[PDB]
Amino acid sequence: APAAVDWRARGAVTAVKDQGQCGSCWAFSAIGNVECQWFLAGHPLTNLSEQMLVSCDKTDSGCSGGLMNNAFEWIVQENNGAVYTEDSYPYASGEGISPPCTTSGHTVGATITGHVELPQDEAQIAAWLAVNGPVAVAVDASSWMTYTGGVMTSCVSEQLDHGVLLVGYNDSAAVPYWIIKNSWTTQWGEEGYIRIAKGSNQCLVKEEASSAVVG
Ligand SMILES: O=C(N[C@@H](Cc1ccccc1)C(=O)N[C@@H](CCc1ccccc1)C(=O)CO)OCc1cccnc1
């Protein structure tokens, strides 16, 4: 694999978002992955709808949580592969409730054909990301309320509870690290991003890695 990758500098990553009071991290993780995969398939970088998932994917639980792999399966099985534009289905859950699903009045921004579940191995995840792009992952975020910048050490690694997006890595740094897009505004972390140490399963980062497939 390359020594380092950062998709943020290569036109593939949209702006950092704010999930607000809703437990919708799973939707921000899945949609951020689709946005990146859609661009890397040769389509324009398009802002896509988390609200579509939060309100309409009834195989997940709205502001009470969900699984990125359930979301990817719902898009293909129940929604004809479609992911709506943000502009046409804007985020409406910042107060902490999921409003009722709207089943018309939206425009398709992207489509997916399926998804892949990656091995529980940090080097194998990095190799896949270097070629195919950003990867949805779950982490234990319980220590992330102390993060201020730099490469975090000693992440509490007990129980997966938070969905986020791997956008790069650097194996050549003094301490090798992952680069992760969070959904807690740009005032948090490094303009909304966090770096964690790579190679010791920090925050359980290797355990539930997956990606949509755009054909
Ligand atoms: O809790 C979650 N998912 C987690 C993320 C996750 C993804 C993959 C592996 C492990 C963790 C999730 O969505 N977390 C939510 C919080 C969910 C929550 C809300 C109220 C009280 C307790 C917890 C987030 O916003 C993460 O920041 O899903 C429960 C679920 C499972 C299947 C169907 N519906 C819900």
The Cα–Cα gap between 91 and 93 comes to 6
Is 162 considered catalytic here? yes
Tokens 């921000």 locate to 28
Using the mean position of ligand 1's atoms as its centre, give its distance from the Cα of residue 156 in Å.
Answer: 18
Strand boundaries in the chain, DSSP class E: 4-6, 82-84, 108-111, 114-117, 135-139, 151-152, 162-170, 177-181, 193-197, 209-213
**Of these residues, 36, 170, 182, 203, which one is catalytic?**
182
What's the rounded Cα separation, in Å, for the pair 35 and 170?
22
Q: Give Cα 114 to chain centroid, integer Å.
A: 16
* Nearest residue by C-alpha to atom 28 in ligand 1: 66
The two structure tokens encoding residue 158:
């007990």
Candidates 211, 104, 207, 209; CA nearest to 160 is 207
Q: Residues 106, 49: contact at Cβ < 8 Å?
A: yes
Write out the residue range of the structural domain in which residue 11 sits.
Answer: 1-215
Ligand 1 atom 35: the closest Cα is on which residue? Answer: 66
- Would you say how long the chain is, in residues? 215
CB-based contact 33:212 (threshold 8 Å): yes
Ligand 1 surroundings by CB, under 6 angstroms: 23-26, 60-61, 64-67, 70, 138, 160-163, 208
Which CATH number does the domain housing residue 83 bear? Answer: 3.90.70.10
Distance CA 70, CA 86 (A): 21
Nearest to 122 by CA among 112, 135, 111, 131: 135
Position of tokens 């303009």?
Answer: 191
Specify whether 43 is catalytic: no
Instruction: Report the candidate in 31, 162, 53 with the shortest Cα–Cα distance to residue 99.
Output: 53
**Measured between alpha carbons, how far is 133 from 26 in angstroms, rounded to an integer?**
18
Identify the active-site residue in 36, 56, 115, 162: 162
Q: 97-128: buried (b, 16+ CB within 10 Å) or exposed (e) per residue?
A: ebeeeeeeebeebbbbeebeebeeebeebbeb
What domain count does the chain have? 1
